[PDB]
Amino acid sequence: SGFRKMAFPSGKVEGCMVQVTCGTTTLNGLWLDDVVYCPRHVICTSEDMLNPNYEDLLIRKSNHNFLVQAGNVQLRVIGHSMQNCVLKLKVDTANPKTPKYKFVRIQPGQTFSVLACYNGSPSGVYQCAMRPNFTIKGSFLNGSCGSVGFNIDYDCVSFCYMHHIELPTGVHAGTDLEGNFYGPFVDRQTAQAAGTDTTITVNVLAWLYAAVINGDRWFLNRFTTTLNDFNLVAMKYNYEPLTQDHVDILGPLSAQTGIAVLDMCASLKELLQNGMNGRTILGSALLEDEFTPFDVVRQCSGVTFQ
């Protein structure tokens, strides 16, 4: 029993973290085989932040302008290239702790674990979702850039996020591991801001199912609803529309609990219209939307990783 915001075990990623320095700027890199991945803004100077031309800044650098440290050991940079907003530093040594891994670009509403790091050293691990507005509500301080987000599947670390910037509302923006930003954000100093966000409906539904699995039914009702009629209410409360694909993904949880998806939608509708009335669900007084259907199955079934 119990339901927690659960991160993946971080060890396979801890062994990949390094420190990268260029000029006066130090941040984190990811060391996989003989390449070190990091945000290209490490090559920026505080003077050319408004409109840096990165191709122009990088052609002026040599391999020896980059200091890469793994633990106490310096790694010698023997090659470098830019791919979108990430720099790839080829180093003389292949990481002996390189796990089986993939690079993945996730969709909004998907969750991942973040290993917050400073000066190449892990600080902590927590679970986040990619919001519909392509920000994440992380916890990141100066020096955290290059920290990565990831999922694990059996043996395989799927890296999906590298941290680059904090927006004025204090939420966070970054790239996939190929250096493409999520959302419309850029790695320059501009007036950019998080767009209006919405609640991830399919995830709230997954979490209502977790609550039932964990022996709590108080919020259920006898009604049902149509997808169309539910989406009319969703829209009204700033919830993402629920698609038939979402309904199908919620199938296994519907089946394990005996509650049809559209019946759970009716319960959610009533919760949005009436509130919780000072009651809680899985210890929360708010409707939680940073658990996916897969996250619920994983933690209510005890899937492990090898």
Ligand X SMILES: *C(=N)[C@H](C[C@@H]1CCNC1=O)NC(=O)[C@@H]1Cc2ccccc2CN1C(=O)[C@@H](NC(=O)C(F)(F)F)C(C)(C)C
- The residues annotated with a catalytic role in the active site are 41, 145
Which 8-state DSSP code applies to residue 174?
Answer: E
Residues 18-77 that bind its own copies (CB under 8 A): none
Q: Please enumerate in sequence order all residues whose Cβ is within 8 A of that of 10, keeping only pairs 6 or more positions apart, or say none.
A: 113, 115, 122, 125
Applying CB under 6 A, the site for ligand X has a residue count of 21
Pick from ligand X, Na ion, its own copies, none: which does 27 bind, CB < 5 to 8 A by kind? Answer: ligand X
Which residue sits closest to ligand X, CB atoms considered?
Answer: 145
Position 41 contacts ligand X (CB under 6 A): yes
Please, which residue, 11 or 79, has the CB nearer to its own copies?
11
Position 117 contacts its own copies (CB under 8 A): yes
Q: Which residues pair with 161 in a beta bridge?
A: 149
Q: Residue-wise over 270-304: b if at least 16 C-beta within 10 A, else e?
A: bbbeeeeeeeebeeeeebbbbbbbbbbbbbbeeee
Contact criterion met (CB below 8 Å) for 234 and 242: yes
Q: Which two tokens stand for residue 117?
A: 């790091």
Contact criterion met (CB below 8 Å) for 20 and 160: no
**Binding residue (CB under 5 A) for Na ion from 53, 121, 221, 243:** 221
**Binding residue (CB under 5 A) for Na ion from 22, 85, 86, 261:** 22
**Side-by-side strand order, sheet with 86-91:** 73-75, 66-70, 17-22, 25-32, 35-39, 86-91, 77-83
Compute φ and ψ for 140, nearest 5 degrees. Answer: -145, 135
Binding mask 263-292 for its own copies (x = CB under 8 A): -----------------x--xxxx------
Please, which residue, 76 or 137, has the CB nearer to ligand X?
137
Please, which residue, 80 or 172, has the CB nearer to its own copies?
172
**Binding residue (CB under 6 A) for ligand X from 168, 258, 278, 302:** 168
Please, which residue, 99 or 143, has the CB nearer to ligand X?
143
Contact criterion met (CB below 8 Å) for 281 and 209: no
Residue of 113, 121, 46, 57 whose CA lies nearest to 87: 57
Least separation in angstroms between residue 298's CB and its own copies is 8
Position 23 contacts Na ion (CB under 5 A): yes
Position 23 contacts ligand X (CB under 6 A): no
Position 143 contacts Na ion (CB under 5 A): no
Q: How far is CA 152 from the centre of its chain?
A: 13
Residues 176-235 that bind its own copies (CB under 8 A): 214-215
Binding residues for ligand X, rule: CB under 6 A, are: 1, 27, 41, 44, 49, 140-145, 165-168, 172, 187-190, 192
